[PDB]
Amino acid sequence: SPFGGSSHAKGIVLEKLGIESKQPNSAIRKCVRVQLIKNGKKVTAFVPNDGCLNFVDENDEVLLAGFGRKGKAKGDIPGVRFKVVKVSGVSLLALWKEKKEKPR
Amino acid sequence: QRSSDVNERKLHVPMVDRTPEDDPPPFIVAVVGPPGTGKTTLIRSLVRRMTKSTLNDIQGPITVVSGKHRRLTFLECPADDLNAMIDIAKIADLVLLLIDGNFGFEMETMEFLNIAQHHGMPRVLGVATHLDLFKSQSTLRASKKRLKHRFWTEVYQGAKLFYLSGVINGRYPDREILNLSRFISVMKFRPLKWRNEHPYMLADRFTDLTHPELIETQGLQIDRKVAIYGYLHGTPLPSAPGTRVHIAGVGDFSVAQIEKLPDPCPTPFYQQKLRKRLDDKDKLIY
Amino acid sequence: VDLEKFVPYFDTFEKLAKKWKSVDAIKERFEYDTWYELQKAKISKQLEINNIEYQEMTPEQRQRIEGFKAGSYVRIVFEKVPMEFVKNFNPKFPIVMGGLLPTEIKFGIVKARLRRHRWHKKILKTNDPLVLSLGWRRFQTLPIYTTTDSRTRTRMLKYTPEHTYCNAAFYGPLCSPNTPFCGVQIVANSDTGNGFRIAATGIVEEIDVNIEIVKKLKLVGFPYKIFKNTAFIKDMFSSAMEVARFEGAQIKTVSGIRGEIKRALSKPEGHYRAAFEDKILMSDIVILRSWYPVRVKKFYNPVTSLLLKEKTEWKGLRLTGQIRAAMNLETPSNPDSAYHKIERVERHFN
Amino acid sequence: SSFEKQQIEIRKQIEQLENEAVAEKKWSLKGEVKAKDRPEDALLTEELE
Amino acid sequence: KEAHKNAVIAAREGKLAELAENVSGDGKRAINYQILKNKGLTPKRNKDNRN
Amino acid sequence: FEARQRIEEKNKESSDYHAKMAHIVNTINTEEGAEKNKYERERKLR
Amino acid sequence: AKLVHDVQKKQHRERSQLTSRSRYGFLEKHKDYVKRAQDFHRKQSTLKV
Amino acid sequence: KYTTFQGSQNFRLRIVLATLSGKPIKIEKIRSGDLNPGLKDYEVSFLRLIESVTNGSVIEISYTGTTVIYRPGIIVGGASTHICPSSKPVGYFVEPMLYLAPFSKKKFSILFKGITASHNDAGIEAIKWGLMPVMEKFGVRECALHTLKRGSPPLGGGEVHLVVDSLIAQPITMHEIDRPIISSITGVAYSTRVSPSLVNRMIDGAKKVLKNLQCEVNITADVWRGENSGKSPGWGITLVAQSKQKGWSYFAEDIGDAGSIPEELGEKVACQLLEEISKSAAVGRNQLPLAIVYMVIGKEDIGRLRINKEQIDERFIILLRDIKKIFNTEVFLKPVDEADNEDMIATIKGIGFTNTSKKI
Amino acid sequence: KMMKNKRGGVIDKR
RNA sequence: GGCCCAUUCGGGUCUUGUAAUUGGAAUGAGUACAAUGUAAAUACCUUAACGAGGAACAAUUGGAGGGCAAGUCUGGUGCCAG
Ligand SMILES: Nc1nc2c(ncn2[C@@H]2O[C@H](COP(=O)(O)OP(=O)(O)OP(=O)(O)O)[C@@H](O)[C@H]2O)c(=O)[nH]1
Ligand SMILES: [Mg+2]
Ligand SMILES: [Mg+2]
Ligand SMILES: [Mg+2]
Ligand SMILES: [Mg+2]
């Protein structure tokens, strides 16, 4: 299993590596470097989109899940296997829909 | 694969808790609610159980020994002021969120929650009052269930929401108040980034040290020398004077002088140190 | 004697040689389960070292170094306090004191990522007063909302986005990056009304002493003589001297036809020659895109509620809409800027 | 009093800002400027990019 | 021109008065529908799905 | 003169950005792809 | 449409010719210009043949 | 108001400490009684270096030049070039930048031009092998001083590039309560615009003193020839004693003057390295001022550094007094439990300094 | 290009 | 005009569409007078009055496609491509 037996993995956000990419909503912009807390290994994960990139800032707790791709996409960056499903204990989709506020 | 998932939940971001190992300060309990929701009566009801002494009038912070090594400071936030709702939100370790069950949620109840969430979420307890105003049990249950679930959106799911029926002699039921005192004792406080990085203190008394002669020879317009007392929180405060400090609603000032005084409401666990229940003499109020 | 001389003092060379003929004197010199637990062990160890050392120090020495530790009941004396604080003192309203770090003392431009609160009814406008709550302090500022334009420049926005974050720049006491905050427009009870009073939410991203917000400025001219690619334009500039400054500049039409400012025409003043990739029409309008700097207003109005007698009707600079209503001024409007329905006739060619 | 003195200064500062928000924006601030709209020979001094 | 200006100002003043009509006479402020249900941003859904 | 400087600066900035974006994309593909393939074969071995 | 609000996909209304230039006619946009360029290239292609 | 200092003494440190603390300072009575009063040219240039790497700072010099008022801004950094006056070498200006570079908004990429060596100031190899390693111990992972061209006195002509790629919140908490074990001795013998025999004659002289030791000795011969050899003839040697167990280093340096024997300089510097080792406990005397400052600006924790009885000199005291005037921090010295030596432990509590200029 | 993004400056009155 | 099949060209079939207006009936959630009930009481059952057009008395979740600007960015072999 990618997370050593877990379906989801806790992590610490290190940097938003694609913050300076010019093209909006690019694949690179949606990538964030995360350190798994269980073993300290650094990995790369996908944010749902640039809108969700605002909610993630450095040093938060993030729950990661495997990123499954049905078919090849032109702009995808293969190798990124994880997507952020929660930040600070709150679902990104809930924040993205303005149904919750990130507690700090 | 539950074991792996359970082990994951134990993991968090490593943080530094600046709470001192010995003689920690009393925790600040902020009683927030719309006007007339029962802030004052709840504080009197809680203090009476914890101390057995009833206060006819309450003004400013009230410190009580609620446990063998736990002290609490109750503060009644003005319900008509938003500026107050901000600065307590930055220092309150616990928040007793009062909700009028008959009326339902109000703006200021939601406004405080949003302020707290952005400035660092503290522990929040929901307390529902005015439930005796309901005439039917069926509608009361539905109203209670609706309030709890909306409350679970603002605060983590499974958050405790209380229910208080009515007031007798300006006091809530003795048993229900007992449960409130119980959940306050078991609850655990996590560190916050901003409270663990600055020193702060909620003033217990206020005093003017200006000579009365100066007030006359020059006039009341003259600036005043003031001494302020209270428990220190957060990181240690530097001993030497001249440290720059901010008083909410007043401005920035420099500490002219500072000294430590003996604890006015010392915790019993310290005194005995110099399975067993708290002694009746041990519980104090300041 | 002094640190400007980096090299330290040494004895005379012959003395050192005799001293160091023999080198005997200096011859003597020559598991936690998870990564999470390893970090926590590192924190606990350092905290343990702090406790051990402070115990070794004297009680007076300890206070001198670490200072008054938390839990201490202390008396703090202040001078030059306003008299209104003593007179208009209400014990119901708490007095909260917070220590300040060195950065909090400094004043400068604060760069933050800011969004209109989802429950707020209206969007926020640039240069519109907003009461911010940073750290221990509350104050009113005039923020400027900006966008990156695909990470090329800091372009000034007119309003906050309806449902997303935007960069904001405002002048105020500097705070460490990653400090969250919230904004309100009204704090007085008289103006409270019934709506939600939390206006903006955001986080500070950077602190600076200066910023280079810039606003798009488009120069507009019109063609009056066209020869296939080449055309003569008017009303863009007032004199030929200005045109020479912009010779070689990139221009385009509304249709998207790109061109260049070739030369300034001698007669009349301000007219100039341009060449376009394709023939333009008389109805077309040529545009020159240019950028003009914008300045942040240095306005600082701390919220001193406790000093006032009322403590709940603090009022500062009003909103633009409120200002217009007081002086009975119509909301500025440009008839050309309004949108109308456009019906297109079918296009036919000879 | 000192508090009263700075309140007067702020009141002066508020008054001028209230007038600026009312006042018509400078030509450069307005989008889509034209030769007639702006003052003559303005572009020479402004040093645009 | 003054007649047109007075008409525009009066129209705004009437609208502001109409908004002020909404505020309840009683002091208590109740959360509106948006805050209560907390539906957030959702797509437009057909009424046929309701049953 | 000013036109010459602006064009050269813009070209230099554009080239660096493309090199920088290419670098971060290539390194991510190589290092994370290796772990992706390395994990996938163990699942195949299982 | 995945992870896109309906607010993002909001119509941007089209502007019109200025009143001062109303005599010259309809303000051509990119789609209008494409009709001109395509027609001219078609005729020039046949003429060249 | 202003923290007031007297004289030209500790000019760079007082300016550097003010920048790190953010507290404005005033320096007055600078060489009042001299025939040429006020600041020196290299001091004015150093201030010009400060304003180029910070933003919002106000530096006003009196009409007579004997008083300076400094109101520090925020450390920004960036890419720039500095022309060092002949009066001082590059190391006089590179050294203070080591205190500020790791806590900057943007990376420090400064190009220094001028004389690259002197008798009183830090050399290129002293910075590269003696000071920068101390920075690496404190958490500055990536720092580099490239020697593009060497310039010997008097005509100089050298060029060096300082690049500190690591930006950090603050130096880590230090813990070294032992005497590091020296495992080997390394060094660089360099020469410009002269025959290669001179650098070899140094190593013979230096090896003569150090051959009695029980460790390996390997001194580099970095002869500079061609366009990059500067404009003047000169030579010098730098020896570094290394402790790979914890990456500690002690070093000695000196250059040669006209008419001086290369063998003597190799012998003199070799003797000084042993004297420095005898006077050191955990860091050299010339590294001590650097280490202490990084302790002061650390996190709110107790760091521990072992120092020798000899290292506490007039220079050491004036450093601690200046720190207290700025940071109000007190260095607490306690004896070690050992009887073989008279070492103390200097325990300092950090001020919780943080790099707030860096955007997040 | 040097003066574009600076606010301070060494004010020498000698 | 709608719909169906078909890679292709095309082929097959007929009451369909409204993003139009409009009428009177039905009743449940709720708002609730009672009796019955029970040691008393809750609850159950039974039962007056009121209770619908945005029937705003305002269930959601997920997926597939579009389209728009005097807008922004990138690569080019004009007006293009992403
Ligand atoms: N019926 C009923 N009345 C209650 C309840 N809790 C409070 N009250 C009444 O509410 C009134 C106000 O109580 P307070 O304790 O003064 O509440 P408060 O928050 O202090 O009000 P303010 O200080 O004026 O802002 C009192 O007359 C109480 O009798 C309850 O559960 N039921
Ligand atoms: Mg009360
Ligand atoms: Mg729910
Ligand atoms: Mg009908
Ligand atoms: Mg439903």
Q: Which residues pair with H224 in a beta bridge?
A: H192
Stated in angstroms to one decimal place, the resolution of this structure is: 3.2
Looking at the domain assignment, is residue H117 inside a domain?
Answer: yes
C179–A contact, CB cutoff 8 A: no
Which residue is it, tokens 């203190």? B201
Pocket of ligand 1 (CB under 6 A): B 35-41, 79, 129-130, 132-133, 164, 166-167
Structure token pair of residue H328:
């109000």
H116 and H255 in a single domain? The answer is no
Buried b (16+ CB within 10 A) or exposed e, H205-214: bbbebbeebe
**Closest in H57, H61, H73 to I13, CB measured:** H61
Looking at the domain assignment, is residue H142 inside a domain?
Answer: yes
Query: Which residues of chain C make contact with A37, given a CB cutoff of 8 A?
Result: 34-36
DSSP assignment, residue A38?
Answer: T
Compute CA distances H46 → C59, H61, H88, H93, whole Å.
43, 13, 10, 7
Cis geometry, peptide bond prior to residue B34 (ω within 30 degrees of 0): no
Rounded Cα gap, residues B230 and B225, in angstroms: 17
* Residues whose CB is less than 8 angstroms from the CB of residue D23 and which lie 6 or more positions away in sequence, other chains included: none
* Residues whose CB is less than 8 angstroms from the CB of residue H109 and which lie 6 or more positions away in sequence, other chains included: H77, H78, H79, H80, H161, H162, H163
Which residue is it, tokens 């134990």? B10
* Residues whose CB is less than 8 angstroms from the CB of residue C229 and which lie 6 or more positions away in sequence, other chains included: C275, C276, C277, C278, C279
Number of domains in chain H: 2
Which H or E element spans position D2? Answer: helix D2-22
Residue B42 CA: nearest ligand 1 atom is: 15
H212 and H146 in a single domain? The answer is no
Rounded Cα gap, residues H28 and H40, in angstroms: 14
Q: Which ligand is nearest to the CA of E51?
A: 5
Looking at the domain assignment, is residue H159 inside a domain?
Answer: yes
Q: Is the CB of C278 under 7 A from strand J?
A: yes
Residue B129 CA: nearest ligand 1 atom is: 31
- The residue range of the domain holding H212 is 178-274
Report the 10 Å Cβ neighbour count for H128.
Answer: 20
* Residues whose CB is less than 8 angstroms from the CB of residue B267 and which lie 6 or more positions away in sequence, other chains included: B23, B65, B68, B69, B70, B71
Q: Chain C, 291-330: which CBs lie within 7 Å of strand J? A: none
Which residue is it, tokens 């863009």? C236
By three-state DSSP, how is residue B116 classified? helix
Q: Which residues pair with H240 in a beta bridge?
A: H186, H251
Of C281, H299, H337, which Cα lies nearest the Cα of G35? C281
Of A23, A67, A26, A60, which Cα lies nearest the Cα of A45? A67
Domain boundary (H225, H249, H274) is at H274
Three-state secondary structure along H241-284? EEECCCCEEEEEEEEECCCCCHHHHHHHHHHHHHHHHHHCCCCC
Structure token pair of residue B149:
């679930």
- Give the amino acid at B166: G
Residues D8/C312, Cβ–Cβ less than 8 Å:
no
Q: Which long-range contacts (CB under 8 A, 24 or more apart) does B49-53 make?
A: B49/B174, B49/B177, B49/B178, B49/B181, B50/B181, B50/B283, B51/B283, B51/B284, B51/B285, B52/B280, B52/B283, B53/B285
Looking at the domain assignment, is residue H209 inside a domain?
Answer: yes
Which residue is it, tokens 């109840």? B109
Number of domains in chain A: 1
Which residue is it, tokens 């001109």? G36
Chains touching E, CB cut-off 8 Å, 3+ pairs: A, B, C, G
Rounded Cα gap, residues C296 and H63, in angstroms: 34
Query: Which residues of chain F make contact with A20, given a CB cutoff of 8 A?
Result: 20
Domain boundary (H219, H254, H274) is at H274
Rounded Cα gap, residues H192 and H230, in angstroms: 7
Residues A68/A43, Cβ–Cβ less than 8 Å:
no
Q: Where are the strands (E) in C118-197, listed by range?
A: 130-134, 137-141, 144-147, 155-156, 165-173, 180-184
H151 and H170 in a single domain? The answer is yes
Query: Is B40 marked as a binding-site residue?
Result: yes
- How close, in Å, is residue C220 to chain D by CA atoms? 5
- The residue range of the domain holding A19 is 1-104
Looking at the domain assignment, is residue H54 inside a domain?
Answer: yes
Rounded Cα gap, residues E35 and A99, in angstroms: 10
Compute CA distances A40 → A14, C2, C219, F32, whole Å.
12, 46, 56, 16
Which residue is it, tokens 């208080």? B164
By three-state DSSP, how is residue H104 classified? coil
Rounded Cα gap, residues H248 and H238, in angstroms: 16
- Best probe residue, ligand 1, of B37, B112, B135 (max atoms within 8 Å of C-beta): B37
Which residue is it, tokens 């409401």? B265
Which nucleotide is at minimal CA–C1' distance from A97? J61
Residues C109/B258, Cβ–Cβ less than 8 Å:
no
Buried b (16+ CB within 10 A) or exposed e, B196-219: bbbbbbbbbebebebeeeeeeeee
Residues B67/B185, Cβ–Cβ less than 8 Å:
yes
- Give the amino acid at D17: L
Rounded Cα gap, residues F27 and C54, in angstroms: 48
Rounded Cα gap, residues C161 and C164, in angstroms: 6
Handedness of CA C19, C20, C21, C22 (dihedral sign): positive
Residues H284/H243, Cβ–Cβ less than 8 Å:
no
Residues H14/H322, Cβ–Cβ less than 8 Å:
yes
Solved using: cryo-EM
Rounded Cα gap, residues C103 and B75, in angstroms: 30
Domain boundary (H256, H274, H292) is at H274
* Residues whose CB is less than 8 angstroms from the CB of residue H322 and which lie 6 or more positions away in sequence, other chains included: H5, H10, H13, H14, H17
Of I2, C108, C209, which Cα lies nearest the Cα of H55? C209
Handedness of CA G1, G4, G9, G10 (dihedral sign): positive
Report the 10 Å Cβ neighbour count for C310.
Answer: 12
H88 and H138 in a single domain? The answer is yes
Residues H105/H168, Cβ–Cβ less than 8 Å:
no
H73 and H212 in a single domain? The answer is no
Q: Is the CB of C69 under 7 A from strand J?
A: no
What is the signed CA dihedral for H31, H37, H38, H42, rounded to 10 degrees?
Answer: -100
Looking at the domain assignment, is residue H360 inside a domain?
Answer: no
DSSP C90-138: -TTS--EEEE--HHHH-EEEEEEEEEE-TT-SS--BTT--EEEEETTEE
Residues B219/B57, Cβ–Cβ less than 8 Å:
no
H215: domain CATH number is 3.30.360.20
Rounded Cα gap, residues H350 and H328, in angstroms: 11
DSSP assignment, residue C314?
Answer: -
The residue count of chain A comes to 104
By three-state DSSP, how is residue C22 classified? coil
Rounded Cα gap, residues H359 and C174, in angstroms: 13
Q: Where are the strands (E) in chain B, listed by range?
A: 27-32, 62-65, 71-76, 94-100, 123-129, 161-163, 199-208, 224-234, 244-247, 251-254, 257-261
Pairing of strands H302-307, H344-349: antiparallel
H63 and H182 in a single domain? The answer is no
DSSP assignment, residue B12?
Answer: -
* Residues whose CB is less than 8 angstroms from the CB of residue A65 and which lie 6 or more positions away in sequence, other chains included: A7, A8, A82, A83, A85
Residues H300/H350, Cβ–Cβ less than 8 Å:
yes
Report the 10 Å Cβ neighbour count for H11.
Answer: 23
Structure token pair of residue B132:
């005796």
Rounded Cα gap, residues H15 and H43, in angstroms: 11
Q: Is the CB of A22 under 7 A from strand J?
A: yes
Which residue is it, tokens 């390997």? H218
H319 and H334 in a single domain? The answer is yes
Which nucleotide is at minimal CA–C1' distance from C229? J78
Of B72, C163, C242, which Cα lies nearest the Cα of D40? C242
C-alpha neighbours within 13 Å on the C-beta side of residue A55: 28
H18: domain CATH number is 3.65.10.20
Q: Indicate the burial class of G46 (C-beta count within 10 angstroms; 0-12, 13-18, 19 or more).
A: exposed
Report the 10 Å Cβ neighbour count for B130.
Answer: 19
* Residues whose CB is less than 8 angstroms from the CB of residue B48 and which lie 6 or more positions away in sequence, other chains included: B54, B171, B177
Å from CA of C92 to ligand 2 middle: 9
